[PDB]
Design a protein around this ligand. Sequence first.
Ligand SMILES: NC(=O)C1=CN([C@@H]2O[C@H](COP(=O)(O)OP(=O)(O)OC[C@H]3O[C@@H](n4cnc5c(N)ncnc54)[C@H](OP(=O)(O)O)[C@@H]3O)[C@@H](O)[C@H]2O)C=CC1
Ligand code: SF4
Ligand code: SF4
Ligand code: SF4
Lengths: 328, 93, 144, 208, 44, 96, 156, 156, 176, 112
Amino acid sequence: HHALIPHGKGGRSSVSGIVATVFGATGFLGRYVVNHLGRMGSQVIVPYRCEPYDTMHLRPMGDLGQIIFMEWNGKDKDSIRKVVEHSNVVINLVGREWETKNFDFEDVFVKIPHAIAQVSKEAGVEKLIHISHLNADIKSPSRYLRSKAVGEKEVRAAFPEATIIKPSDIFGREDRFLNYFASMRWFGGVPLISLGKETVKQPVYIVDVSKGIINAIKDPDAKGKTFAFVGPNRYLLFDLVQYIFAVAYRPFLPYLFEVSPFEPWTTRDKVERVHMSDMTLPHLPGLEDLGIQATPLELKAIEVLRRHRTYRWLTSEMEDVKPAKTVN
Amino acid sequence: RTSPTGEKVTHTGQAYDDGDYRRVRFSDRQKEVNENFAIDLIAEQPVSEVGSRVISCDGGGGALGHPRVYINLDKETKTGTCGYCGLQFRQPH
Amino acid sequence: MELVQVLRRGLQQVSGHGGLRGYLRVLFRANDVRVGTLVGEDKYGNKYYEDNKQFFGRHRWVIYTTEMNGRDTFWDVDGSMVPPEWHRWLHCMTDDPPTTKPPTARKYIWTNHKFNVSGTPQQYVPYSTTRKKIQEWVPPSTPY
Amino acid sequence: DTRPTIRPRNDVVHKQLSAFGQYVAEILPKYVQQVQVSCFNELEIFIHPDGVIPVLTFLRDHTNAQFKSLADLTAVDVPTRQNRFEIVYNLLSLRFNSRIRVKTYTDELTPIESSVTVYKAANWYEREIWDMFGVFFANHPDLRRILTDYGFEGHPFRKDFPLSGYVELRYDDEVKRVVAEPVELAQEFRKFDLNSPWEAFPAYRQPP
Amino acid sequence: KVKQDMPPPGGYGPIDYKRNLPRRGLSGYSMFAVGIGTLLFGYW
Amino acid sequence: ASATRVIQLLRNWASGRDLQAKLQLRYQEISKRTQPPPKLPVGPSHKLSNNYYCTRDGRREAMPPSIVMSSQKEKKAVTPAPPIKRWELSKDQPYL
Amino acid sequence: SRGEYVVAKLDDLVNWARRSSLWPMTFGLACCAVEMMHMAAPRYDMDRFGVVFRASPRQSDVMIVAGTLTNKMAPALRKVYDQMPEPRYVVSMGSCANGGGYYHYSYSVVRGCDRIVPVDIYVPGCPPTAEALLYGILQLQRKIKREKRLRIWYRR
Amino acid sequence: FEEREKMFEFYERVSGARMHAAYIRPGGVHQDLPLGLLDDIYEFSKNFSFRIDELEEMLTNNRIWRNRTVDIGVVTAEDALNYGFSGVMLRGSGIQWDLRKTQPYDVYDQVEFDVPIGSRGDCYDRYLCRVEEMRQSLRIISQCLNKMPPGEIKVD
Amino acid sequence: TYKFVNMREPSMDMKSVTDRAAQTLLWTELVRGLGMTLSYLFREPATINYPFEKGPLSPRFRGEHALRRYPSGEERCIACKLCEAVCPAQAITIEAEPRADGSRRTTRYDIDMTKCIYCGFCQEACPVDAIVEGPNFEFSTETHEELLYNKEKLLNNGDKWEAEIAANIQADYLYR
Amino acid sequence: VKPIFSRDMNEAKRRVRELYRAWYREVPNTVHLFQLDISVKQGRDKVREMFMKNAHVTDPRVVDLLVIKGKMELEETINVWKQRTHIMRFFHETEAPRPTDFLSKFYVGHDP
Ligand SMILES: NC(=O)C1=CN([C@@H]2O[C@H](COP(=O)(O)OP(=O)(O)OC[C@H]3O[C@@H](n4cnc5c(N)ncnc54)[C@H](OP(=O)(O)O)[C@@H]3O)[C@@H](O)[C@H]2O)C=CC1
Ligand code: SF4
Ligand code: SF4
Ligand code: SF4
């Protein structure tokens, strides 16, 4: 029904015929996804629950009448219906790394995704892009990963052709993974369980994940396939943190926050997930399947961590830190 | 008038179709529609009967109207219609 | 002396706004406490006053209504609340109040002036007023 | 003719300007190619481009030609001529309360001598001419873009340059900077053909 | 008849167009004398 | 202005000029915004006779620039114009 | 509830402070800056509303883009905007700032400051009359008054 | 600036826009003056001289103002001509040049005024020149208000 | 013809030198300026009480564009499109088709106020006084899309402001 | 025709090499000055690419003007007259790659 012929040169004023409802657009991955849709000329329907002021960053990402902001409630199915009725593609990015007063990991990673998928199918949405985690497992101890996998199964049940993506520790300018390690100063030295010597993580670049999502939407065979976005290289957690502090000009000092009512600095599940080595699933399609070539962390490391410089490393000395050893 | 979708039809005969994605723009905002259809309004206006074969209409108000045009009423079945105003004039039978 | 006259005039202004309560009300709703002849009041409730003694620009003023078009305006005095007919007199376009010289009545003219609805759910959304230009071909519904 | 509609014309100034144009041509036969006085009393001297500095220096220092003020230095791009760019110098003589125009021609490659030595005001004018049209000025103290963007490519005022340009600017969150992207107009500039099919001025008719 | 906005019969009145900055204050000798007198009274 | 005589005197003394004579704020010398309907006049060519446009077509009476000299196939010295006359010092106020 | 009542009242207090003491920075670029000055002129006197022209952008809350944002000036506008502290609001004054106005099809004019910086209030006109600009600021004040930042944090 | 606001009203009364008027059009002016406009112009010009004098009272004789202007940015007359300076720049250095006098246009030949001429070429003299130009402008305005002829406002 | 600003030699009379030194030492001129500002303090402020008090405006004021109707109720616009041509910013987009009755009625009258320069050429060009800039200057929006005015928006603006627009035209049509 | 600066192509090539040396040596500083995320090799690769783009020119006059324009860009880069975005504009990043295969262009649009 809502099929639009793409017309234009793929610019801001062009028409790509992608009416997309990017759930959780006001987020780290959300911004890049909206920007890619906006630069192509897509009708990005933005459902938001926060203040409209917090959504202003998404306004300049699209041409006039291309970014539509409408309020939605995760506890209201009707809100989901009115925000995906005219959409031909729905992207679900709703996920909080810490539980809240009225939203628990189950609600954010099972209940809300399932409601979106069920409503989208009833509305007739062509494609759904759910965003899981690579380490998500039904029997994983962490509630975060366990709940994410539970919702992933329910997403497939409601939306049979849903294209589920499982990124692994996305890194970027406004990321909660690289910046989190470079914020160990608040947490004394560098709190590392067992010096983080048994954890190998595979981080993925933010743009790579976002471009993959856009490519998945265009890809005609991506429907119904559970993609897993893996990083270019696997780094030892200790080496990765050493590299992070190195380019951030931070003294490497190798070495409760859930209570904080404001956004928790650290979560028990986050601590477990940080010290949990990233899984390796070779049976799932990756970025190369979608055509996106993985970008090494080294090239984009400075863009995320130069801003965390202390006194004289972004200039003057400007010592070049060599790439950290990769456990590959 | 209102479309089957529930969207009021403009006097320009425009109504976003059910399959039209652009209909989302009125999701939480009203669709500005003028509620005085001009075509209906002139139809209300009565047809003047002027004995003269040729009459001139300026739209009323002189300089506040439209360029004066002279209308011929020879046609018996048809009624002379102002080019600008649209007012209909007839010659009494 | 004239100072006593000034103070007495201030007390007169206090009385003229309908007691201390009204005096404070106009003080905190309009930040002005001078009185003037009530030229007229629109249907929405805004009251218009004129004092020729005041210098040009403050000779005419409007006290906005508390409730207009189902909106509380006790503190939110929108500048677009002024009805079109009073707009001429208030903005000094004409020297004739609409009460003295009513504007010509036309059926198409609105019966309820609406303030700027930007930011409200009744805001105007742009759209095309034309129809589809190129009609497409309909495939036959009967299998060959 | 007469009556208020017609503009009054002063013949005395016309005669004076014609005489002075002949004066300049006689003094500088090496460079002066043509001398014209418009019907609205504006003397114009056409000079070979090699004579930019000599002719201007004569028109500035000569006792009977004290044009010591460079009013405006501009260029006119006519693509139908081999020397498409036409460099026009507008001068002012306070001593004799008169103005004169020195018009020269140049190509897209042939350099033109800078007149900064003659008039110090020529600096920024020639910078603008180079930036907008692309006319290189030899021996210029500092010839660089003065009005366009720093990284801009192309000369905008050229008749072959698109009005909307080739590139547009916008802010991109992914790169966290203002980026340049190919121009895409939501509403194309509607070209209006207004030239009437009927001749308007018989006096300026070009015979076939 | 023609009713353009025109100068009134007889024209408008005169308009000041020159600097009016007046002369105020005592002479230099007098001002210095006043200051010195205040000083002398203070001293006494 | 509605100011006490004392305030007026203090204001004038501080300024050094009679401010009440020329107050910047406009009170009543302003012209009435509502004015009588005007009757603008017609131009010199609003006539029913001797009004042929050929006699008043200044736009079509322009001519191409006259070519005084073209390189393509005792005189006295000539100035562009008579030399400018020295300006004369103002008589209303010679020195500001 | 009591918690909602406390949060709502505190949010209203915070909203009142910001809207009452808005500090704008004059990003005067073109003709519209002149009318902006006439807004601060005695007749209208934006300071009467608490809106005092803060020269320092580091101590400003509202950026009034007044004029034609050219391509050459475009990077500076964004860089100044991100150096503004939050909460920061952008008010676009004039058709040139809104969508390019007279120079929309120019080769070196940004097609509206909305592309470079997110805009909150658009003031129409060329130039918008000082009252219209004052009206826009008051509309921004009402916009701030409607904001419920704390309430949403509590109801999160 | 309040006086500038009053003059902006004169623009709006005759054109309908405060700053950009498009009133002077090739061929004349768009419309005739609205009845009563000339009278208000006379009232403003009558009290405008006092305002200029008040400006001089606060700046002209002030020693701090002189220190910031006297012997600052001195331009030799010959340099000004060679550098293509015009207007106050030429007059500031003593060059007796003014297009309204040397090359009269419109009916400037039918008005009588005086051209302020500097003596030192510093900023202070140019400041005095600009002030005096305002004074002489009132002189021209009074003449125009008393010589405005009857007729059409556009070429027939 | 020319007046000598400055160019005033100082008298070296001992009295004149004394007064000059008095000005320098006793800071007389600074006190004079201070007194001038003090005088300005006791004047009446010129601030109008917005929005309760509005600034003066003339009937020729140009503001929000509006499409008018004949007294019968028919749209004056007869789709001549010359207002589209005259518009110096190319802001008006007009598409017209023969109406069911058969008159020249536009199917699209779009003007983006974000591109319009509020020149007023459109109202001067219209031969039926259909498009007339209204008196409303306070129509600021919060989103760019709102500025782009549809034909329906223009018709509604005309219907809202018709009384004032007609009164102003009646008060100014003689001048035009 | 009067040569702009170089009478012969060999003289023009001398000017080209001089400009290339200056650009090659400036690239490391430019990355430091504007804190660019490109590598020194990347900048020097771009410099060579830009020079190689205009490698089909045969007129010494055109080569001279190209060198003059190249000098002007270098002057702005050295004098920090350009901004970080201006330097990055050489490296087209946000612009989506337009394919060259006819079948791809056929799918993309009506592009000729
Ligand atoms: N490195 C990573 O961050 C990785 C994350 N993922 C998953 O992919 C997604 C990436 O999220 P990202 O864009 O980084 O955003 P963030 O996790 O940084 O911020 C949370 C996002 O989810 C939305 N959200 C969270 N809880 C709710 C709720 N209860 N109701 C509505 N919206 C909610 C937020 O919108 P709002 O602020 O308005 O509430 C915002 O868009 C998440 O689902 C995440 O779990 C998977 C792999 C790696
Ligand atoms: S909108 Fe009009 S007044 Fe404002 S900057 Fe643009 S052209 Fe100038
Ligand atoms: S000029 Fe008037 S009649 Fe013609 S299209 Fe425009 S609004 Fe309609
Ligand atoms: S007033 Fe001017 S800018 Fe506005 S629509 Fe008319 S012609 Fe265009």
